[PDB]
Design a protein around this ligand. Structure first.
Ligand SMILES: [Zn+2]
Lengths: 105, 107, 573, 96, 7, 96, 97
């Protein structure tokens, strides 16, 4: 059982998939969320097309590195009209950088 | 600056240290201001941040001294029938250098 | 002469007096300076200002890098634990929490965390906080069991070596075998890659584990393995630990000729590298006192424990488990030394100090009580017999009975019904019921002790000898059984003279009882010849009162490393 | 069965509705006038909760729901030191 | 005394 | 006989060599190639010791030399709390 | 009785000691033996006020109880380019953080 963060531009789908389930079910689970067919979308594990045939365990989504505490992100594009777009995954925010008390100042 | 721990890079500081230390041994002239600044260099290495570079400085000094004594040994061995006199002058130079490097490395 | 103070120590006092307005900037100081400010805070008595900065793991990591002034750091830490702040548990939890976050980080950060964990766990194990050093070492192992690379097996087997030392001392013997199996698995993983780690420390820790569970047959084999694994490149601490554990395993199988060499070499190595004021030297002194107490050299053993305790009261402070173990070891040695004299004033004071520390720092259901309590439960018995009153005698015997029952329950819960420690508790209970005039219960307890100990140890083992001596004293003086007492006294005398020779101290306590037996039954020729034997024993006893101090008996360089080890190994054939 | 936890920046953390009702405040926001099923997912606005902390909140939702009544020993939720204070106020406000 | 020291 | 302890601000702090040798680091700086016994006075350039703390160091040199083996009551060295932390860093580096 | 002085002139902060009964000319002698200037080349400035070349340090205005070695009494000093006796320029040491 593997937990993911399917981010496209600013959305962040918090889904849970079986370790043995393939990428096609991961694309089809978005049908009930953003209502767009799996044909017109492709996933992205850090600039890596995730094809329908290969399973989630093959493409590095092991349950050790995508635990619920820190799920592993995966990109997405919705093809626009006919040509897919680049990963515009925006970073969340910069938390207030607490100063290091051991830093000499 | 100030006498505080600071993020000092060991490479260029050790190179500046070595250009003086190679002349501190074998009794070669160095500027007095340079010799006095090498004390601050030793201190900055020893209280560096995040991790003090005293271990690295000691290891590099050991490696340099081993290389220097090896080079002196090669220069002594390559000369025959005059080995005693030039060995004695090399030993006097290296003893003065050892005393002055103990003075320099006091921290 | 009134030498003015150094500008360093004068500015340290000015910095401390201005501590609040310059507390943040002190953390940005060299490690040698920063430790001295905190040591001055401890010296001034400002523990709360010091304890609020030792609670942070990163601030305590810099004072841990001052290896020169570690004897002062141990004393400051023990002051903080006696103060009330639980820095040992706070630092352990902080390390585990900050350790679970960088599990997926790079190799440099994980290496730094592993080094910090080794220094912190070594400090907390040296200070005696084994329940708190285990969490640090568990987190270090958790880092090590992430990437199946080369150096990670070495660091993980080092973690598992250090987990046995913090589990043997914490009396977690059930987890000790599992930790050793995991370490041996990682050594096998190393051996699959053409690299053999040095297994001396692990086998010494396993020998400590098996001696603790009273498995002397296996403990001797594993200490033989550890001594075979000792090389020249071992650290002094590791070879000292292996040597003293091998001595403790050799003295309990009654190989005194080899145990003396091992422990004298261990004491010599501890005094050379560490000094006369070091925790490891004190540990070697405790094991030397264990040797001296087991070989009927009790008068020197008391002075050795007194030297061992005085190191632990100086390096550490008050309520510490190491000071407590030194107290409970010195209390028993003073008990056995002053058994004939009856002056159980220092022995009771030391046994009361041990319980007053262990109860404060350990849970009531912990195994380390079962030692301290029973030691008191011995002394309280002998004070009860010496006291002419009947009310005080009854009260003391009831208190000793409660302590012995508690210790027996702890030993049964930890080891089981068929352990040597349980047999010792049964023998002590038999002696107590003899003192409590419950003669049937005393006989049953002594029979149970004999049945448990005879199969575990040898048929003619020393412990069986002293326990049949106790049973013969019960049958002779109390139960008036004049034949079983005779045969058991003969067994005890034979084993004592076989093992310790004619100088064994229990020989007089057997001869006097046997003379009383024969006076009760007759055969005055036997009484006369045993009076002659007792006179000869007294002669040999007063002749062997040289009692030269064993601290200088180890001498200066009598032999060297891999010579005592080699002699011990070759002597095994 | 999905709800769109919009943060202050604009990040639309679409988490399952069963996970979101772990927090009392989100369950209250999804009750009353807030339960009106606009689109399919109920857009919950969090104008005071940034994205770098709402992501941790949603991760905690999917962590607690998965790890509830766990037989095995449960691992602690990883909260970074820089996020800990902002995730403390977000945990109080959300009553999770 | 009667018996040996307690083990 | 009068060393010239030059601070980081260019201040010269001419003081007797007998006093300045009470600190091990200055004794080291005056031993070796940095002897240079020219016109009876030789400078010791401290590139990272400010004048306001080097003045206190020199005053401590005079204080300690004048109070050697003295049975008279020895008052505490008046270290101002505003410079106590710097002087401490100048008391370890100089070994005074 | 010992009196300790912290004679200052610009960057120079020469340290010295002299008895209570010692004269200002002895301080001129010390400066001559250190700064290599004749006694007429300088005149001391005790608390930015001119000091006579004669007299003594006991009644000058400072004594041992106010010029202890752990807190020496500062003294100004200035030279001249044969005329006009240019004024002292004692600068403060530094600003403590
Ligand atoms: Zn406190």
């Amino acid at each position: 059982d593997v937990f993911l963060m399917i981010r496209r531009h600013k959305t962040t789908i918090f889904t849970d998939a079986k370790e043995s389930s393939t990428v096609f079910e991961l694309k089809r689970i978005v049908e009930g969320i953003l209502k767009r067919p799996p044909d017109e979308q492709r996933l992205y594990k850090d600039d890596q097309l995730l094809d329908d045939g290969k399973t989630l365990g093959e493409c590095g989504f092991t349950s050790q590195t995508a635990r619920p505490q820190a799920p592993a992100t995966v990109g997405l594009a919705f093809r626009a009209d006919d040509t897919f777009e680049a990963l515009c995954i925006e970073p969340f925010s910069s938390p207030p950088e607490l100063p290091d008390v051991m830093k000499p100042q | 600056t100030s006498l505080k721990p600071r993020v000092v890079d060991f490479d260029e500081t050790w190179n500046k240290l070595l250009t003086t230390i190679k002349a501190v041994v074998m009794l070669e002239y160095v500027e007095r201001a340079t010799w006095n600044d090498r004390f601050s260099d030793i201190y900055a290495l020893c209280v560096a941040y995040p991790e003090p570079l005293g271990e690295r400085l000691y290891t590099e000094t050991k490696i340099f001294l081993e290389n220097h004594v090896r080079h002196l040994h090669k220069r002594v061995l390559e000369s025959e029938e005059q080995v005693l006199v030039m060995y004695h002058r090399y030993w006097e130079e290296y003893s003065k250098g050892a005393d002055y490097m103990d003075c320099l490395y006091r921290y | 002469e009134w030498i003015p103070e150094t500008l360093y120590n004068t500015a340290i006092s000015a910095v401390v007096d201005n501590y609040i307005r310059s507390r943040r900037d002190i953390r940005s100081l060299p490690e040698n300076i920063q430790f001295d400010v905190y040591y001055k805070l401890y010296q001034q008595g400002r523990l709360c200002q010091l304890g609020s900065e030792f609670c942070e793991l990163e601030v305590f990591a810099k004072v841990l890098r001052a290896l020169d002034k570690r004897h002062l750091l141990h004393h400051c830490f023990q002051a903080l634990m006696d103060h009330g702040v639980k820095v040992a548990s706070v630092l352990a939890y902080s390390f585990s929490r900050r350790c679970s976050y960088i599990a997926e980080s790079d190799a440099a950060v994980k290496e730094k965390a592993i080094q910090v964990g080794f220094v912190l766990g070594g400090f907390l194990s040296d200070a005696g906080w084994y329940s708190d050093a285990e969490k640090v070492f568990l987190s270090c192992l958790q880092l090590c069991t992430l990437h199946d690379e080369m150096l990670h097996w070495f660091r993980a087997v080092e973690c598992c070596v250090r987990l046995l030392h913090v589990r043997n001392g914490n009396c977690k013997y059930h987890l000790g075998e599992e930790t050793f199996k995991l370490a041996q698995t990682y050594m096998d993983k190393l051996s699959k890659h053409g690299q053999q780690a040095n297994k001396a420390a692990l086998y010494g820790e396993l020998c400590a584990l098996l001696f603790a569970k009273s498995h002397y047959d296996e403990a001797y084999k594993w200490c033989i393995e550890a001594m075979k694994e000792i090389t020249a490149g071992l650290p002094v601490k590791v070879v000292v630990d292996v040597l003293r554990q091998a001595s403790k395993a050799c003295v309990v199988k009654r190989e005194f000729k080899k145990a003396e060499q091992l422990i004298k070499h261990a004491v010599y190595l501890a005094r050379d590298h560490f000094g006369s004021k070091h925790p490891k030297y004190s540990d070697t002194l405790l094991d030397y006192g264990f040797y001296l107490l087991n070989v009927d050299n009790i008068c020197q053993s008391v002075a050795i424990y007194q030297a061992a305790l005085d190191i632990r009261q100086s390096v550490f402070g008050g309520k510490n488990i190491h000071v407590a173990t030194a107290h409970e070891d010195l209390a028993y040695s003073s008990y056995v030394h002053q058994y004939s004299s009856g002056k159980f004033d220092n022995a009771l004071f030391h046994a009361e100090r041990a319980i007053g520390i262990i109860t404060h720092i350990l849970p009531e259901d912990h195994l380390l009580l079962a030692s301290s309590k029973r030691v008191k439960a011995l002394i309280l018995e002998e004070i009860a017999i010496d006291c002419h009153n009947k009310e005080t005698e009854q009260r003391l015997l009831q208190e000793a009975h409660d302590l012995h029952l508690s210790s027996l329950q702890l030993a049964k819960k930890a080891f089981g019904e068929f352990n040597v420690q349980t047999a010792k508790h049964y023998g002590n209970l038999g002696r107590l019921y003899q003192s409590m005039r419950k003669f049937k219960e005393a006989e049953e307890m002594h029979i149970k002790a004999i049945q448990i100990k005879e199969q575990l140890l040898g048929q003619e083992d020393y412990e069986v000898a002293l326990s049949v001596g106790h049973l013969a004293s019960l049958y002779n003086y109390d139960m008036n059984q004049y034949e079983n007492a005779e045969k058991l006294y003969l067994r005890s005398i034979a084993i004592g003279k076989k093992l310790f020779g004619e100088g064994y101290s229990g020989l007089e306590y057997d001869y006097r009882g046997l003379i009383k037996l024969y006076n009760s039954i007759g055969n005055y020729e036997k009484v006369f010849e045993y009076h002659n034997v007792l006179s000869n024993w007294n002669r040999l006893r007063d002749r062997q009162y040289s009692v030269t101090d064993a601290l200088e008996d180890v001498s200066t360089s009598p032999q060297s490393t891999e010579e005592v080890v080699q002699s011990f190994l070759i002597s095994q054939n | 069965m999905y709800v769109k936890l919009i943060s202050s920046d604009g990040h639309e953390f679409i988490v399952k509705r069963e996970h979101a009702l772990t927090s009392g405040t989100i369950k209250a926001m999804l009750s009353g006038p807030g339960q009106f099923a606009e689109n399919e997912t109920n857009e919950v606005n969090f104008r005071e909760i940034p994205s770098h902390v709402l992501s941790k909140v949603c991760m905690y939702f999917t962590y607690k729901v998965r790890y509830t009544n766990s037989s095995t020993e449960i691992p602690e939720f990883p909260i970074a030191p820089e996020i800990a204070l902002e995730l403390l106020m977000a945990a109080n406000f959300l009553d999770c | 005394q009667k018996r040996a020291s307690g083990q």
